Amino acid sequence: AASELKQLETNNSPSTALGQISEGLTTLSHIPVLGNIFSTPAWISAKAADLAKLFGF
Amino acid sequence: AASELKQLETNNSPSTALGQISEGLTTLSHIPVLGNIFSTPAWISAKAADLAKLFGF
Amino acid sequence: AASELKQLETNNSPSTALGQISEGLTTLSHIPVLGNIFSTPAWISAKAADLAKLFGF
Amino acid sequence: AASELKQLETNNSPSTALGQISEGLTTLSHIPVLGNIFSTPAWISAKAADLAKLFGF
Amino acid sequence: AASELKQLETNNSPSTALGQISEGLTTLSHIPVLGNIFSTPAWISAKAADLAKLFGF
Amino acid sequence: SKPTVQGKIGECKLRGQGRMANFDGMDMSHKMALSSTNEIETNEGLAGTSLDVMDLSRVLSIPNYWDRFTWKTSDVINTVLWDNYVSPFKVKPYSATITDRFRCTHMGKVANAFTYWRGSMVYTFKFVKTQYHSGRLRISFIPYYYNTTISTGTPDVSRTQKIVVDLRTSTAVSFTVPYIGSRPWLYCIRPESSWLSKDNTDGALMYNCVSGIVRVEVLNQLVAAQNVFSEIDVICEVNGGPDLEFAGPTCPRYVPYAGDFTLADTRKIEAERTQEYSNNED
Amino acid sequence: SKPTVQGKIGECKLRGQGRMANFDGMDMSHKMALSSTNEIETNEGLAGTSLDVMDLS
Amino acid sequence: SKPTVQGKIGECKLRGQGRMANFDGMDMSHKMALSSTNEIETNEGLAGTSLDVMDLSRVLSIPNYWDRFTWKTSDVINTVLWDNYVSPFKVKPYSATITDRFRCTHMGKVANAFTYWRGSMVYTFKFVKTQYHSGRLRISFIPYYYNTTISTGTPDVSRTQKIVVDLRTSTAVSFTVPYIGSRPWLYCIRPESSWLSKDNTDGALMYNCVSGIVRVEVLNQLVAAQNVFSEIDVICEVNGGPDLEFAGPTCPRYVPYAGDFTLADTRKIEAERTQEYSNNED
Amino acid sequence: VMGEDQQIPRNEAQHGVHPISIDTHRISNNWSPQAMCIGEKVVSIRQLIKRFGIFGDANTLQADGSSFVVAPFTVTSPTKTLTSTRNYTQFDYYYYLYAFWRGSMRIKMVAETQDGTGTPRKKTNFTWFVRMFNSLQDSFNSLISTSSSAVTTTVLPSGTINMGPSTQVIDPTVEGLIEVEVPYYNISHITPAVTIDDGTPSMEDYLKGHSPPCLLTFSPRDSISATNHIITASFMRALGDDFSFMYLLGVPPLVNVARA
Amino acid sequence: VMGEDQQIPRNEAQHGVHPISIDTHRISNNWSPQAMCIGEKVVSIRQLIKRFGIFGDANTLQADGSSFVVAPFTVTSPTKTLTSTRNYTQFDYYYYLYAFWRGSMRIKMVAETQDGTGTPRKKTNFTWFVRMFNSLQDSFNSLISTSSSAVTTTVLPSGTINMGPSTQVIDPTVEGLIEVEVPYYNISHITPAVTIDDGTPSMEDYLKGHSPPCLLTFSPRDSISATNHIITASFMRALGDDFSFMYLLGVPPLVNVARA
């Protein structure tokens, strides 16, 4: 979520990169799995800065 | 589109560069073709980050 | 406070970093103390720039 | 225009630089001429990116 | 003024730096003088860019 | 923690909408499509070609028929066979009887919705004749001369730029008429418009929208074999040169018309339509 | 070209005025002076001394 | 994916409009032109010159006629021939009979719409005479002396800065009068304004807007040959020095007038206009 | 200049091939005409058609439980009179020079509340529910009314607004104008530049691809009353940023519009 | 100081050439006068004219289906009275020192609703449709009314608002003031600083280039009623950021304005 909100600001669009001609693109064999790049929320960490905020400081 | 929205923010204007004296500029022989720099939309890609978002993550 | 407001803008979220799988994270022994990274407000300084503003300039 | 709008954002003020003590500044002999740094509008260019937008892409 | 407006945006707070423990800070002997870092307004300059704007361009 | 705000206060102008009348910038529409990124792709070949046909130069340069005139064996030297106003505003009455409906060309369709015009015009003449017809013509461009009514005297042939063509075996003549004016632009206005007359002289002010005239005059009388029709029908075609441009886009003045003209034109249309879309006869 | 928006939607709190009761921050006044940059200069000697007499000490 | 917002909440002040009264900043107008980027180009030569004529120094420095006075063979030594208030506010009554309409110079046009003035003034005298006229004049600048009514006594000639000119063959005298005051600025106010009188003494407070006077006095009586007119008409011209500046722009006090003045002035105007725009006689 | 074959083929003329100047000089230009006097450079119809114009005519909701229905891609055949009074746009004007088109479409609308003819009007102070139907199934078919205009009024049937189609809720008191964009969502990459003589497209026209399957509805969160509470609206439209016209054709006849 | 040719040519005086000081010292200055007491530096008329001032006078819509028409570039000849009561601007004041000008123009307007003279006024609660006409064709010609002011009132003719010209819709309840900018869109790069004795420009004046072809219309999305529902407006104007005055001329006569 945090990651997506950030990218949305930098590119001012959900799209992360430059386009590709559609004639040469295939994702027919692609099989998505539950664990990915956006599956882990940023609040799950123990870095000093994060823990202080977690306890209300 | 994404590309244009981005440039519009950085220059806070559609204009991408510095001007040129008009007396010495000619585009009389210029012939535009359908395929250009803005003809390919950014959502057409298979980069890891893009595919995850595509499937709703 | 100033520090937190700043981080909130850069990451456009309170979260300061990338996430970590929750199964392998433990803070059971962690004991928070009153003095931390956010315990000292930024207005408490004598740097030239700050003192001028302090006196109303 | 584009140039001025840009500078106005970066410095969040029309002023482009740091000040100078007024006692030692003189522009008595300065004679302004019609052709300057802001006399040429940014839309007058033939760079690839600009021409595509010009034709509506 | 311009200088202060700028710093206020970057730090999104008037405070320019990191804090210091208050127990060890003393400004008892500090004597402020009229001439400082914020005493000279940014519009007082003759740099090319500034003079053009000054004359309305 | 949830700190209290202490930063910058921005200045903002709300918009009920943005760039509505402009071609560039940004549009604030909500998207009805599932994707807030919906946008179809554009490339060469979509409709048969690699070129962009929306570019005005691709439209203005299409050769269009416009008028015709006759050249007879009895027209004496110096007879003016045809005059035409040098301007892209090619919009005229359907005929001498129907003056409230009009014909046009691609240049006129465009001019009919613009404020200014610049550039050259291409003129093409097609002489529908025989190799047994012979005569010489004088064809010229006369900057800022319009007609005997609003112009002083007659043009001095000696000071006029021209081409003298010996027509015997040839059948086509072609050339480009360059932009000539005191200003970088001329106005887009029909020559016959009533707001151009000044002192009871129709079109007296057209020198603000027309650069002059192209003229065809007889030099050596046309002669023809006794066994061929003694007249030549001359077709006149016109289109824009590479530098023909316009500047102030607005509302069109005249608009597309799908109604009728004449009882005889409608019968022809019906006969052709029957031939074009029947399964038998209708 | 004029692409459809697809970026970030900000969150904003409108102010009828800002920092009215505070000594620092920013003021949102419209300037009646010809220059939106109007600001007089401050220096030593204005009224006979180099010290700032507004300082409580 | 469409994540829920969790970032920064800004602070914003809405504007019904921005910088309306200022010369710099930004304007929030919607553009009616097709391009949201519409802007014409500026360069040297547009109207004949490379210099920017909107710069006040280009306007203030234009030499302007202002007044004239006579120098006679009978004016004895020490006779005050002419006095003038040192200030850019050159706006006076059309004449002795018409006091509700006025004449001005470029300095006055500007001063008529500003709060403060600084700088020097250039004075130019043109003696319309002959090479057979001879005499010496005393021409000076007297800081903070105005007239016998609001100033104490008469100026001490010995303590006055001046030029003593021997006029025989020469015909022109010129010099610049520098800014002299206790403050960095003086107010822009007409010397005759009624809000300047204090104790039944007109203009008693003008020392807050006028720096003093320029004066011309006779030193050696003018002598002339018996065969030449025994009087010299002296033209006085004035304009701003390189450092003449103003500070607080506002509304103008007086405004352009296109009406009439006198029955005799209108006949002259009509006669000249006939000569200027006729096709015969009107 | 003169010969048996001086004529220049159409396709070559579209590449800039032209006869020599009667002047003998080469044809040339630069950008000073536009920069010194106009302030911009106009070179394409792709630029022109993106300008919004008024769409529809005298639209109102005066019946209980009424709504607006819009056919965003429809273009009406030309007038057959000498007193034309309809609304024209840069889009439908240049439409007549081409045989094909493709792309999204933008619609905008403003609206007021009124208690009778000639009485005061006030900006609608409530939200609007905007819906889009695309599948050629039960809901879409029940909405088709061939004799109605591209901007018409009706009481939406049941099995329409309660089925959950693409829905965008717009609050005018905060957004100002209502602005929405309809995608191309077409069965192929191009559509014939067809024209409708009377009204709107039928099922056959959609199945043929003569128009993308798209019917847009605008419903007010207010109760209408024929007797004393009506809503007066005005719609505008313009092609989206990915729109194209293709395949040039010849011109049609013209006529002046009603002036009075 | 004294001679047969001490006079300094006009063109040289405009380069700063001046006679020696009666003081003998060199003329000098610095920025302390402005920095210590004023807070800014004023050096050009190009700065002054960008300030907005009230344009027009006592403008109202009290007739059914009425609108405002504005001639943005027009400057009226000077008063011929001793009781002048019109509105003045920094723009029309310095206009009289030059022979030529060029550039865009900015217009702004505010408006209220009122049920009669002396009764309460309320900010217009509806949208405004602003249109610009430029071509010297049918629409523009039907709008010309030489005897009307640069800010006048009329019922727009048909073949005007339905033809799709440049159109910007502004919602006051959200934008505050109505702000629009008209481009130079001129036939050449400069225009004579002409003045109109009575009213507005005619076709001949436009064809001659005495004023850029520009007529701006403001139409309210409300129903006006002479009897009890009127609209009271106020317009303002100022030259755009690419505007210039050129070729200095001599000054005109002056007069005081009506004070009371």
From Swiss-Prot, chains F, H:
Signal peptide: none annotated. It is found in: Virion; Host cytoplasm. This is Capsid protein 2. It comes from Cricket paralysis virus (isolate Teleogryllus commodus/Australia/CrPVVIC/1968).
